[PDB]
Design a protein around this ligand. Sequence first.
Ligand SMILES: CCCCCCCCCCCCCCCCCC(=O)OC[C@H](COP(=O)([O-])OCC(O)COP(=O)([O-])OC[C@@H](COC(=O)CCCCCCCCCCCCCCCCC)OC(=O)CCCCCCCCCCCCCCCCC)OC(=O)CCCCCCCCCCCCCCCCC
Lengths: 68, 221, 99, 99, 119, 119, 65, 65, 68
Amino acid sequence: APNPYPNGIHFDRVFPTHYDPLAETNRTKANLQLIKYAPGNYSTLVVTSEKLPRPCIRTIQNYRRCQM
Amino acid sequence: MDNYFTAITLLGLRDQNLPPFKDARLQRYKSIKKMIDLIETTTKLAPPMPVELFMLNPTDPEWDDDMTYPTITHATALYKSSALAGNLFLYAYNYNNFTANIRLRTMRYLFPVVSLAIFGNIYWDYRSQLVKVNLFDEYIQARAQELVKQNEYLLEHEDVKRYVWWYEDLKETLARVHRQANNHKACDFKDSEIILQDFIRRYTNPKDNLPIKFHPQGQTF
Amino acid sequence: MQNTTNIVHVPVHMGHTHYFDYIDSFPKLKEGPTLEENHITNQKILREQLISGQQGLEQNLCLRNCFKLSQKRYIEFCLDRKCGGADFQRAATILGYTK
Amino acid sequence: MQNTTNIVHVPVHMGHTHYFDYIDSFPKLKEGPTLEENHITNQKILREQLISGQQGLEQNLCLRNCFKLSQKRYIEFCLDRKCGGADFQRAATILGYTK
Amino acid sequence: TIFAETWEASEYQYRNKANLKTLPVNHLGKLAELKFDFVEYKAHQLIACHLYERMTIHCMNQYGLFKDFYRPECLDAQYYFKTCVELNAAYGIQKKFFPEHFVGSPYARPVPQFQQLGL
Amino acid sequence: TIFAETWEASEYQYRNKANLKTLPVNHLGKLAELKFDFVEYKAHQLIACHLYERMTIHCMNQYGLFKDFYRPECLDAQYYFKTCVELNAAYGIQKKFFPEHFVGSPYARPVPQFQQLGL
Amino acid sequence: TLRAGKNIEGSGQVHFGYHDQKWGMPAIPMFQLMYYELPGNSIVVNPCRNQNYRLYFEMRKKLGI
Amino acid sequence: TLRAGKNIEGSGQVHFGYHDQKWGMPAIPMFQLMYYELPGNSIVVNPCRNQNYRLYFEMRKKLGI
Amino acid sequence: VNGTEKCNSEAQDILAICPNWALDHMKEKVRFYTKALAINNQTYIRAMQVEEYNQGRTVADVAPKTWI
Ligand SMILES: CCCCCCCCCCCCCCCCCC(=O)OC[C@H](COP(=O)([O-])OCC(O)COP(=O)([O-])OC[C@@H](COC(=O)CCCCCCCCCCCCCCCCC)OC(=O)CCCCCCCCCCCCCCCCC)OC(=O)CCCCCCCCCCCCCCCCC
């Protein structure tokens, strides 16, 4: 799997490690007492939307149809 | 359930008993609904009085000292005195060794020097704390009397008289309020509405967009 | 949101030290005079105020105490009652409150 | 805020039984016809629709499919192209969309 | 001011805040703790905070205010009466000037007008 | 669109949301993992996502796209280039239509006008 | 924190979510030379508080004490 | 819950704050007769799904299958 | 002393020195007291409303009675 894209977000456990994702080529593995990395090793930023309930959609369609 | 004592008094629970049936009883509860709005309005027409009358202004730069309270640690001085007395017992319990055994000569020679230095610290802290408490007590009394004579004149303002006259007008008005009937209707205080409305009309202008106007020293709650 | 999250409006510089995390310096931090140089400076101001700035002080203190009141009508009552009948705008110019 | 907090808009009644917490009843709950009575009622409707409600159905199905389009200009294009040149307001009256 | 004997318990619960207190009805069980004889009508026990007051008067008539009133059944009646009128005055003011804090108010979670939906 | 080589890291961090990703500068250390010889100017390495694009071209010129490009140094360059232009496109749109989400924006926590303070 | 108005789900400081954790100091000499626990007795009132006593000494001389 | 968008401070279900806890079934016969754990295999798809197969039988007859 | 028109600098010092939470508290106090003002005035209108049983009646029609 490719090296995850550099992400400076991390969470310390014992001491501040000052993690720099650009200081090493391959990201070192996360030890339990040292660091926890940000979620989504392989993730991008998108925009999403919830789907309105089906009965709420049927009333919107009925209003538009009755309107036109 | 605010205005509890007012509502209980208007219902007559101070002198009589409510009707035992829910119909007439629940109508009597809704009958004081108009009078509560009137008495609530009367209590929001009080004129202002100088706030610097019984309360010094806390935002004055004089109080930027952030002075603390000087105290005497009685418990600390009493413990350390008992621990010093414990050393005196330890010497007395072991008197014969500390006195005759030459291997303990340094303890015999320098025990009182350490004991005096220990007593010196116990009494110094107590004595210094005692002086600071007395300096604090004598200043707040002297400074308070200077501020009283400085602000005595504020009691000569007419706003104090305007405030008392309004309170006495409310007392005479609420004394004239009376229950007129026992029909468990709002008209049981029919004449009292006219009395209280005349009081409200006396200190406000009903034909305004905002009869009750806001000012920072006003009545909200 | 992270519980240890702060928003700072002035620049800070963090230390690049292992096992430690702190602010080691502030950018463009200029050191003023020492505590002793400031003390000598204040002594000169306090000395002139002690020698040459004590006459007519009782009147100015009354004007200052009157202007710390909440309402203006109480200030005018204080000036008229305690300050020998001083004017509002005239006393405000003395104290330096007039633009 | 308590994590198990719910705002309900209909009345519920909670059972006062030890060791258990649940909704034992709904106030003024009316029981309708059984699943079998609804089945017999629905079969009477479906039987009439099968016997006497299948003539001229293809035209009505085309009008119904055209009115499920997004824009009005596409509905008119559907009626003109697929439904044999039907009118918008006339087809809406057949389907029951007109007030 | 509550203009009835009963009130909806949920109408005095907070909607956008944690509920750490309730506004319960008068504790009728405390009336049976009084050992002496007294006359109390049922038509007065439901109105808020008033039962505790009548209990306090009954205890201050049987006993006084010194060394005889200081018994558990009589001090709880005076404490409940003082606490009841303090909470009800606070909830009443919060009901008048902060109506949108409570469950059941249409302003706790305002429903939008249809013009705001953009349909 | 970023119209410079450098950007403030804090300006692409959220103010009212948890910060789970950053927008880091180009990883110049990956440029040294290429085994072959190539010419790269320092004037092109700071602009966002372009270094990974040039690394991909250098790798696809030395090797092809079949059984020789499939080495860890070349696949990370192509993955970083694809991921970089995806994150920057999302952050760019979010910066354009949701500027109030980021630290440093005057609308993230608006300061009121003096007429709203009632003085 | 609860009395200050923050309801608390769960317990402890081993944060399951996206937070920094602070484990106890490793009881080995390496960390015991770099760190030491915060002594509460070292947090003091600023000595500038003692300068308010200057008011007392001046009030005493004004009153002829 | 964390992936669904709720950051978690601390851990566990022993809520320190103003929340209800559920300690887990006491392993004694009294509670083991009143309670039983939720069997996940009993949560099923509604059998009305099988009525969609009516569409297949009607389509096969229309196509002459 | 000088009027509102000559206090812009003093108004800017409030917006700069006061922390942002304090400015949000100052902004909310005005909105609360605006709400409380409308509530107190609605109580005024209901209180000062002349009911049907008091039409044309003034203080002269009141009986000389007190609370007792
Ligand atoms: C879970 C429970 C929790 C409860 C909490 C309490 C726990 C219990 C605590 C018990 C320990 C304290 C005991 C207190 C008395 C209890 C009665 C008792 O002792 O047991 C019965 C005890 C018999 O013991 P036994 O177990 O049956 O058998 C003994 C063995 O056979 C062998 O015989 P022995 O004589 O060799 O054995 C000696 C025996 C008993 O020996 C004794 O005589 C006990 C003497 C204890 C005095 C402790 C110091 C007090 C200093 C006097 C202050 C007086 C102030 C008065 C002010 C006004 C007057 C001016 O053991 C001790 O010495 C116990 C002392 C414990 C150590 C204390 C050292 C403190 C130093 C560290 C400082 C810590 C800070 C706290 C200090 C608190 C100070 C208040 O009875 C007697 O000893 C009779 C004594 C009669 C003659 C004594 C006359 C008075 C002389 C006083 C000494 C003067 C010294 C110089 C003056 C210093 C100040 C100016």
